[PDB]
Amino acid sequence: MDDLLGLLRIRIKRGVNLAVRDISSSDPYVVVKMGKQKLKTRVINKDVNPEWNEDLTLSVTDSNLTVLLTVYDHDMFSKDDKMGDAEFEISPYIEALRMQLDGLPSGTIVTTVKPSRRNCLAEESRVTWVDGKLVQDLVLRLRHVECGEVEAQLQWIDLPGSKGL
Amino acid sequence: MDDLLGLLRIRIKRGVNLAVRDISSSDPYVVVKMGSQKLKTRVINKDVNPEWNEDLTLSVTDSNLTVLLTVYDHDMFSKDDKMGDAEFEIKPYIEALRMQLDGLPSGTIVTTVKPSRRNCLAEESRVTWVDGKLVQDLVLRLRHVECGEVEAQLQWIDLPGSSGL
Ligand SMILES: C[N+](C)(C)CCOP(=O)(O)O
Numbered sequence: 223m224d225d226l227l228g229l230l231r232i233r234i235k236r237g238v239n240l241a242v243r244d245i246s247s248s249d250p251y252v253v254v255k256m257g258k259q260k261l262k263t264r265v266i267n268k269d270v271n272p273e274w275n276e277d278l279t280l281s282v283t284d285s286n287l288t289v290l291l292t293v294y295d296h297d298m299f300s301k302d303d304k305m306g307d308a309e310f311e312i313s314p315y316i317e318a319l320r321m322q323l324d325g326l327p328s329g330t331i332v333t334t335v336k337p338s339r340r341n342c343l344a345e346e347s348r349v350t351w352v353d354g355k356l357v358q359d360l361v362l363r364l365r366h367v368e369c370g371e372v373e374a375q376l377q378w379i380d381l382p383g384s385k386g387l
Numbered sequence: 388m389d390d391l392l393g394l395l396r397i398r399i400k401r402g403v404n405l406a407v408r409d410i411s412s413s414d415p416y417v418v419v420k421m422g423s424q425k426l427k428t429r430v431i432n433k434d435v436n437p438e439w440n441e442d443l444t445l446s447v448t449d450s451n452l453t454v455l456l457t458v459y460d461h462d463m464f465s466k467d468d469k470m471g472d473a474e475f476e477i478k479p480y481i482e483a484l485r486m487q488l489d490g491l492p493s494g495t496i497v498t499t500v501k502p503s504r505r506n507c508l509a510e511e512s513r514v515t516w517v518d519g520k521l522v523q524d525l526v527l528r529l530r531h532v533e534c535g536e537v538e539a540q541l542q543w544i545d546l547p548g549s550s551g552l
């Protein structure tokens with residue numbers, strides 16, 4: 223689409239020990255923001271360990287963009303409460319995507335991003351080459367909230383027509 | 388593009404009782420085609436009941452287009468052998484994708500395509516609203532071969548941009 227390098231697939235896997243925002247539980251959904259783009263998972267009802275396993279799909283024009291991720295507690299007839307947020311860099315994953323990864327076996331670890339004061343990794347993050355595809359695993363520790371983390375996996379979808387990688 | 392309705396995610400699940408094309412077995416892969424777009428799954432060795440569990444993501448510009456599908460047996464030092472062909476319409480899926488289905492319980496069946504003499508359905512194919520997504524499960528009986536069917540699921544991907552539906 224005349225800048226599009228392709229499509230970043232953010233597999234939102236699960237939230238672990240998310241914060242309580244209705245008495246006893248929460249109705250968490252995730253909002254992803256990058257540039258003008260804004261994607262949301264479904265609400266999962268009354269579960270602070272929600273298993274979304276939901277794919278959000280963004281278009282990439284910048285190899286060097288931030289993905290902001292925010293969790294909210296859905297309240298149907300009132301205001302939704304904040305449940306924390308994180309952000310992560312996609313540049314390490316895009317750099318790795320232009321790397322000629324043929325030949326390397328399944329399970330080849332190609333880049334490692336480490337937890338820093340300034341990033342939201344709870345663990346170090348593995349850009350792993352597996353089954354012919356380049357995948358990055360993320361455990362994001364949410365900011366600005368008393369507990370919780372979200373597990374995600376980045377994957378990549380090529381778009382025929384676009385500017386390419 | 389600008390012309391894009393969205394992306395059809397075709398999940399190739401597995402093959403069942405596929406035909407033998409190496410003396411005693413086969414190394415089958417699935418190839419898919421819509422318009423000028425062609426995609427294939429990876430090869431499974433020596434298995435006439437392969438579990439592919441692989442996505443093939445196509446660009447949809449034409450609601451009324453048809454997906455062609457074939458299975459071939461990979462031969463390392465020869466022309467690959469035929470294992471059958473099928474095809475299916477995306478129109479009933481796309482039209483139902485337009486429906487406003489929130490509030491409906493996960494598991495609601497929304498349309499049912501019947502098997503007919505002229506289509507390749509082994510079973511009536513249902514379009515179901517599950518986990519906040521419209522999905523269509525297909526069992527495709529392979530043509531021009533002595534046995535085999537392919538199980539697949541249709542999912543839709545909407546792109547930020549796009550004509551959309
Ligand atoms: C694995 N693959 C199907 C994607 C490529 C190889 O297939 P082929 O070499 O048998 O044609």
Ligand SMILES: C[N+](C)(C)CCOP(=O)(O)O
Pocket residue numbers: 418425427459466467468
């Ligand atoms: C089967 N064949 C080798 C003759 C053609 C298959 O090639 P492809 O369309 O799977 O890339």
Ligand SMILES: [Ca+2]
Pocket residue numbers: 243244295296297301302303
């Ligand atoms: Ca609340």
Ligand SMILES: [Ca+2]
Pocket residue numbers: 243244248249295296297298
């Ligand atoms: Ca709530």
Ligand SMILES: [Ca+2]
Pocket residue numbers: 408409460461462467468
């Ligand atoms: Ca053969």
Ligand SMILES: [Ca+2]
Pocket residue numbers: 408409413414460461462463
């Ligand atoms: Ca063979």
